[PDB]
């Protein structure tokens, strides 16, 4: 009654069902995942093949979709495995294996094209003229929310310059200890932007976590051109909200649900494991600010690359050798 099918809750997988729906509706990722040459892989341990089955089943099955063979493929069959990892770690586990499988084939370099961005982090001396530039990549950004009112205020805190004065002077080597300024600047933003909000904190005093249920606002449209170093016209960093991963509860109780507008048209649905239901745009955006139910991860897509990232995926996009192998497997289950 929604056009989309859900995922089974086969124990305690937490954020995994929410993450699989996010990656499955990254249509450029989905079509590229179908392209992987996996005819000769082992179904017991091949997670690229395992991800294809889940994607094919999410596209065709009328019944809730199973993930048992997928969890077994990357070694997280223990029910504690998902509680002992963050949502970004799981995504890196999936993306690393599909990108390594894409090496040497026609869909090589997909993962860097969608999710990779370029970041610089510097240290600039105040007295002497020494600067240590450091260029590195990212596939996801961790934002601080405690004290910060909205996504605007978390991005300014991410780039804010830190003063390395006092007994915290920077070791400039030959220049000796020097007062300095450390900071981070963004060079490029990826077409599909993964943003994890730090809604949880372990203090060492008491041996337990603590959830930030403070109110944190995020927009449907996020212009990030201000935070880009060397902004270019004709391609602003204007992003559109696609997914909002939601955790409700406290330090002990917790449920992981995701809201998504599939086609990018602002028509939202709630994906509660096996129950998919239409929902208002306010329930997916403004009801998840907090102040308890609130969001912990956000997925944005560049408006310029919006059309090709969310391109329609038809049955012809799935290779027939893959198709015949999955429909093979389906016949042996029965």
């Amino acid at each position: 009654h929604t056009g989309y099918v859900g995922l089974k809750n086969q124990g305690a997988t937490c954020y995994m069902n929410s993450l699989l729906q996010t990656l499955f509706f990254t249509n450029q990722l989905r079509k590229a995942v179908y392209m992987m040459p996996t005819e000769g892989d082992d179904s017991s341990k091949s997670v690229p093949l395992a991800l294809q089955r889940v994607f094919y089943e999410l596209q065709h099955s009328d019944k809730p979709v199973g993930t048992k063979k997928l969890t077994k493929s990357f070694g997280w069959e223990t029910l504690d495995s998902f509680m002992q990892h963050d949502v970004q770690e799981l995504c890196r586990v999936l993306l690393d294996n599909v990108e390594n499988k894409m090496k040497g084939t026609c869909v090589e370099g997909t993962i860097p094209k969608l999710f990779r961005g370029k970041m610089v982090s510097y240290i600039q001396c105040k007295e002497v003229d020494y600067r240590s530039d450091r260029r590195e990549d990212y596939y996801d950004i961790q934002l601080s929310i405690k004290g910060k009112k909205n996504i605007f205020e978390s991005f300014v805190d991410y780039v804010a310059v830190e003063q390395l004065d006092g007994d915290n002077k920077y070791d400039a080597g030959e220049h000796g200890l020097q007062e300095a300024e450390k900071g981070v600047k963004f060079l490029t933003l990826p077409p599909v932007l993964h943003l994890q909000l730090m809604r949880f904190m372990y203090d060492p005093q008491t041996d337990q976590n603590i959830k930030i249920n403070d109110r944190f606002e995020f927009p449907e449209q996020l212009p990030l051109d201000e935070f880009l170093q060397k902004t270019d016209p004709k391609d602003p960093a204007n992003y559109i909200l696609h997914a909002v991963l939601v955790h409700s509860g406290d330090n002990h109780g917790g449920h992981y649900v995701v809201y998504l507008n599939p086609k990018g048209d602002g028509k939202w649905c709630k994906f509660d494991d096996d129950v998919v239901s239409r929902c208002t745009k306010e329930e997916a955006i403004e009801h998840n600010y907090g102040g308890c139910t609130n969001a912990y991860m956000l997925v944005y897509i560049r408006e310029s690359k919006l059309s090709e990232v969310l391109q329609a995926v038809t049955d012809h996009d799935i290779p027939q050798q893959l198709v015949e192998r999955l429909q093979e497997e389906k016949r042996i289950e029965a």
Binding site: Q84, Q88, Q142, R199, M201, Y202, P204, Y256, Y296
Partner: peptide, 14 residues
């Protein structure tokens, strides 16, 4: 864990 750390989910140790 043994220090002030943040996560996006309820991450526990092993």
């Amino acid at each position: 864990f043994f220090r002030i750390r943040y996560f996006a989910t309820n991450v526990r140790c092993k």
